[PDB]
Design a protein around this ligand. Structure first.
Ligand SMILES: COC(=O)[C@H](Cc1ccc(Br)cc1)NC(=O)CCCCCCC(=O)NO
Ligand SMILES: COC(=O)[C@H](Cc1ccc(Br)cc1)NC(=O)CCCCCCC(=O)NO
Ligand SMILES: [Cl-]
Ligand SMILES: [K+]
Ligand SMILES: [K+]
Ligand SMILES: [K+]
Ligand SMILES: [K+]
Ligand SMILES: [Zn+2]
Ligand SMILES: [Zn+2]
Ligand SMILES: [Zn+2]
Lengths: 368, 375
């Protein structure tokens, strides 16, 4: 089966400045650093591993096409789009609104290519040209709500893709499964009132954004029951994540019957990620991808599009990401070289608090 | 500003601590067959600790510190904590043209790397000596390479010599202290320190750590020492996700009672910051304010029981962004000069770790019965 793969060189050129997360701040005594948390290198190393592993030979490279204004407006307000144009047109770019998420001059180009990468892959998987794909995009998306950029996200890539599959490809139902460790508040916002896009987020409870991602956030109106948050406790590893998959996510998808499953695929739930406290290993992500791809095979003719979200371990992210790619190609050519080191650390036993957190969500399936 | 409210607080930073060659790998070596791409910043790159030093300076804290030169630990110093075989092996590895593998396949010394290892251990010793004479009331030795994994007869987990054990050995043998406590709050088990003082009740070793984080299969509460040393090793393994609340409960329910029961003449803290909320090498949720409170508690304990004699010795910690602020917070508790906020405080404050969870309470409670056997 033909597996689409998007990497655009510019994805690795996203300028993350000289700060750690916020900018270098002299009065705060936040010393400048050359590797920002969100530095594009982590995602670049993933791409390079896809290549150096030989996975790329089993992949069909798909060129990103710049997401058009029409594309973006299917997920975002006109005001946000205008604002991003405004910010990117600034001489040296600037603040997109949150004081953290920066765009350099002409940075809109990369934002368009990131969203457009998700769209082009979605387009080609929906035509049946490809069976599935991974769009290794950057900047990420899931924090961008309808009317803003946020949390390194300029546009909500997966929502742009979903909105494309809905409006252009005429699909009635699309699901976005987001397993980036942070809450997909942006995706939740965009599709809040809309039952034609089921939005599911697995995330460390209150990791980022603050005060966001409670399971009580279920959508509104016609969209009520079509947003599912699965907030998990810090220290949740493979057992908790797979339990979440098996108890909530896959039942949710099966209940909902999407024509397309889009995965907001971050790897910041990994054992080694600085930006959360979760204990997922490459094998955990492998199993999560395997489960979702199989579900897609069962319920929507295998139509599944992975779209890169977060993840901040330049050491370990590439192997987490590679594991996902291997599940897509079915070519398994490399061990996770950290497996031995991480295997004894824990996370593979479903703890009672993990179980309880997931069980809280099971009643919500009834409303799908 | 020349009227200070603190006594002399020692501070050790030697330039070479920032020059430890960590190579081109992430954690183990970059390995082409495994397709582990080389990387410019190894997890344990010295920049993280250098950034801590530069923040000590740039914040103005250095103006409230008494800079203390590291002196190279002598063979005699090292030998109070390590075997002649280990010392000789480190000399052998450091004499190799490009140095090499110290034994475990990850812990490397370049040629002449022994000089830095002696300076790291010697930094802890020098500070300890100068607190002991009363010249300094307390101090922070911002040493590198770290120590706590190195047992009597090996280098391990980036540790060449067990710096705090070298310091404690010196306090025992040279300063004639009868009892020394080593409190190790680096997030990983202090297996090395535990090993060194296993049979010896004259050094109380306490480790708080993420359960089985590193080393594997190490750091159980059943590891209690042996012979006359039985009851004088205390492991407090904690669940992943443990934050300020668990750590401070650990301090209050186990650590401080342990120290009070033991009555050391000196407290040495193996001070890592890898339990921080943003560290890649553990899953703990300690913030700078958590470390502040741990430091405050431990210094106050030292004030109460051993005339304030407390020596902090740097261990691990892998957030170049956040470690400096964790470390700053601790040093501010030494000087009482609280002159800089944690700029990450609000970002991290709502993430959690500030509620003592049942599993966290329960893990700590396991250790409480062990206090009864302390001295
Ligand atoms: C890619 O393989 C590794 O991860 C590498 C080698 C290893 C492999 C397997 C095991 Br079970 C243990 C170690 N492990 C390490 O380099 C472990 C470094 C220890 C980090 C802890 C340092 C610290 O802060 N101690 O307090
Ligand atoms: C020093 O201040 C900060 O750390 C900075 C700003 C901030 C400050 C306070 C709060 Br309550 C929230 C955010 N933090 C962020 O903007 C957080 C963005 C990173 C997390 C999202 C990345 C991701 O992978 N999302 O999926
Ligand atoms: Cl002062
Ligand atoms: K919806
Ligand atoms: K998520
Ligand atoms: K002992
Ligand atoms: K420890
Ligand atoms: Zn994320
Ligand atoms: Zn002063
Ligand atoms: Zn450590």
């Amino acid at each position: 089966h033909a597996i689409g793969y998007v990497w655009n060189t510019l994805y690795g050129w996203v300028d993350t400045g000289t700060g750690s997360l916020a900018a270098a701040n002299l009065t705060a005594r936040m010393q400048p650093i050359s590797h920002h948390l969100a530095h594009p290198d982590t995602k670049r190393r993933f791409h390079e591993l896809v290549c150096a592993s030989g996975q790329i030979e089993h992949l069909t490279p798909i060129a990103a096409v710049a997401a058009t204004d029409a594309d973006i407006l299917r997920a975002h307000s006109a005001a946000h789009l205008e604002n991003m144009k405004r910010v990117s047109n600034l001489p040296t770019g600037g603040d997109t609104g949150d004081g953290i998420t920066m765009m350099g001059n002409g940075g809109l180009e990369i934002a368009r290519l990131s969203a457009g990468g998700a769209v082009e892959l979605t387009r080609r998987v929906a035509t049946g040209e490809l069976s599935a794909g991974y769009a290794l995009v950057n900047p990420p998306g899931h924090h961008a709500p309808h009317n803003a950029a946020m949390g390194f996200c300029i546009f909500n890539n997966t929502s742009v893709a979903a909105g494309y599959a809905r409006a252009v490809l005429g699909m009635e139902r699309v699901a976005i499964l987001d397993w980036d460790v942070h809450h997909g508040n942006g995706t939740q916002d965009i599709w809040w009132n809309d039952p034609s896009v089921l939005t599911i987020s697995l995330h460390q409870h209150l990791c980022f954004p603050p005060d966001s991602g409670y399971s009580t956030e279920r959508g509104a109106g016609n969209g009520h029951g079509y947003n599912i948050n699965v907030p998990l406790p810090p220290g949740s590893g493979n057992a908790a994540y797979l339990h979440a998959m098996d108890q909530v996510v896959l039942p949710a998808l099966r209940a909902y019957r999407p024509q397309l499953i889009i995965v907001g695929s971050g790897f910041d739930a990994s054992m080694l990620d600085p930006l959360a406290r979760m204990m997922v290993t490459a094998d955990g992500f492998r199993q999560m991808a395997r489960r979702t791809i199989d579900c897609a095979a069962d319920i929507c003719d295998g139509r599944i599009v992975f779209v890169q979200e977060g993840g901040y371990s330049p050491h370990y992210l590439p192997f987490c990401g590679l594991a996902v790619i291997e599940e897509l190609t079915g070519v398994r050519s490399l061990p996770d070289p950290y497996h031995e080191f991480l295997a004894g650390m824990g996370g593979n036993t479903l703890l009672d608090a993990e179980r309880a957190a997931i069980e809280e969500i099971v009643p919500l399936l009834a409303d799908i």
